[PDB]
Design a protein around this ligand. Sequence first.
Ligand SMILES: C[N+](C)(C)C[C@H](O)P(=O)(O)O
Ligand SMILES: [Fe+2]
Ligand SMILES: [Fe+2]
Lengths: 378, 378
Amino acid sequence: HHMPRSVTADASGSFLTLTFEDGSESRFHAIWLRDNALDPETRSPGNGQRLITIGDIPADTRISTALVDDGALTVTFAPEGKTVTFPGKWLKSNAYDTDQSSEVGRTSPDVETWDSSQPAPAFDWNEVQSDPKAKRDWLDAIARLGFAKLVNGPVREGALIECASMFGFVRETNYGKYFEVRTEVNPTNLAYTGLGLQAHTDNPYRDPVPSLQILYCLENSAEGGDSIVVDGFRAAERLRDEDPEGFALLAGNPARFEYKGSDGVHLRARRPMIELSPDGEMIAIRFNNRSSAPFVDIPFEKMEAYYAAYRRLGEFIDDPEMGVSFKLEPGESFIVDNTRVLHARLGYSGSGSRWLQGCYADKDGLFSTLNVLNAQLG
Amino acid sequence: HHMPRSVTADASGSFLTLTFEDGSESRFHAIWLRDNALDPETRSPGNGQRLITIGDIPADTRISTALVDDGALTVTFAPEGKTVTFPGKWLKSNAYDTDQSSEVGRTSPDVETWDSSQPAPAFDWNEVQSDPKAKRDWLDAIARLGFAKLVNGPVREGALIECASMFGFVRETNYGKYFEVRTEVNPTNLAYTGLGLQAHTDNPYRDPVPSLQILYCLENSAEGGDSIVVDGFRAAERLRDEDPEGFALLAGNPARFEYKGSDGVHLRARRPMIELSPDGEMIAIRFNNRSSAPFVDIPFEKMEAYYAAYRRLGEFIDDPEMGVSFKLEPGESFIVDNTRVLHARLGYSGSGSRWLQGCYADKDGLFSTLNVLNAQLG
Ligand SMILES: C[N+](C)(C)C[C@H](O)P(=O)(O)O
Ligand SMILES: [Fe+2]
Ligand SMILES: [Fe+2]
């Protein structure tokens, strides 16, 4: 099935049809094959960079001659007269003559959505540093599920920056490379500190949104206040399955977010609460009650139904059965994919203090590190 | 103009229609007005953040009474019995009943597109550093035009980091805090050679894409090495106006991008070459011949047309009448909005030396700095 058997070219030379040993067929256009040639004059052997532009490829490029031999495809292009070969495995892996799904709001096959039945993934600080398999599994959990907990870390200021550096790079803001989250819980504030905060993604007013968030515990002597995570993709899925028109409104119209502090910070963004790829795949969630700004982009005739959908998404986010809760002891931390997984805490149940440190990092670095680890372990 | 004259409420109480003194009308829904109330129980007086969730607003919310007085609208909401006042100017500025354009591929009102007919805007290093009016003008140019030169700067290694610090924060990547743009033996990227490069946006394989790039000249004494910038929005507009089907193909299907230039890095992204907001406004351009990966997300029946559109976009990008060309002197630099404005360079050779330094920053910080300067200067 990854082993090519034979090939036929069209009389035009505009495409060819590759038949594999299992009977399956896959068609490839001449232009696509020429642009994706893997030979040293198309792709630099040293760095993999393509050496030619689309403009460099003759617009009348066609397949002149083609043949399957010993697991590979030989193709010669006219009018260049250029012969290249493609390994069979590569052609199958990079095929586009497939039945690509067009389901609106579908999740990527790489991710798995969850509710309160999902245990919090937990990994050991020392093991992820010394065991590449543990590191791979830690980062893979953040990739697939959008969060993971790291335990047995050092009780040291700035330790979260060391965590970030294990896979990527910190998104520095006006607040610094990291920020302090100090809480004092006492009878004078327990009326409000004793209630939970609505789950949210951080900084939807930043474009580009910081794509990972790390929260790291240094001190905890206050009862309750468990951290909680909610899968924005699951909330969005539930809306879509119940109410596809409401989902389409939240995906089809941008919201506005703003943070205009008294500390000389003024951040604004214009993005939808549910962000889809142009072919319908769900790629990001932005939900934060505190920084939502006037919605000026939604037409008058859609505003009521938009608000109804918005309210419904909030109910799914507020649903106790959607939240995964956990304790953070000193030296423990968690990361969330801040383009997907919302976070908050439950109410505090007793007096004391807490000291967390917070920072942002970016997913591209995490995915790169994961890719490198998979290649090293594969 | 923004002075309310009169108001009518709908029979349902679901919206009101505000008539201003110039005869213009604007409708506002009960739910939208309630959610946007500016009073101390809905919005913090200290930081302007929202103190309610969408779920806190009653399900039955409607307008019980509404009156115009002292250039403002006073509205009472049932069932809360909550009365709030909206200034006339606030209502005009935050109106959504504005007959929003649905022109696909339109640019934001805040940007202005360009070609080779406008000389490069240039600002002075010492002026932007000391004079906040000059800084504001420089940053506003980058915001509106996506491009500005900064000249008469220091011939010093790392000076670009000082430049970044004038408005925001460096996005550190695999390439470093900053990178050395010079010929390297065993280059990790074709930028590190003497070759000419087609106009491109940096790192389309990175998601999130770096939103700003700084390029800073230390040496440019070889024959060639001229810089060219191209407005990707202008190129996209031309394709839109000439060939709406081709524009739709590039906006409606994701491309793939990949960089694996050495061991220890493997960056991938799945994004369209033309990114639109869900309401059709142009958001971003991603275009890079060197790191475009096999396009696997485009149906077989659309791939030929997709490539034709990609070719045509490339022709607009390569058009000499689109490119703004200059050769940097030591201590001169430029910034591009890397989500919009492409940069290129001509190959260099012979005696002499070329040495540029590059780094990434983010637009969110630039806009905040600009927003703060605008407040402080008026
Ligand atoms: C090497 N680099 C200058 C940092 C990036 C390249 O210009 P690319 O974004 O085209 O790969
Ligand atoms: Fe938060
Ligand atoms: Fe570049």
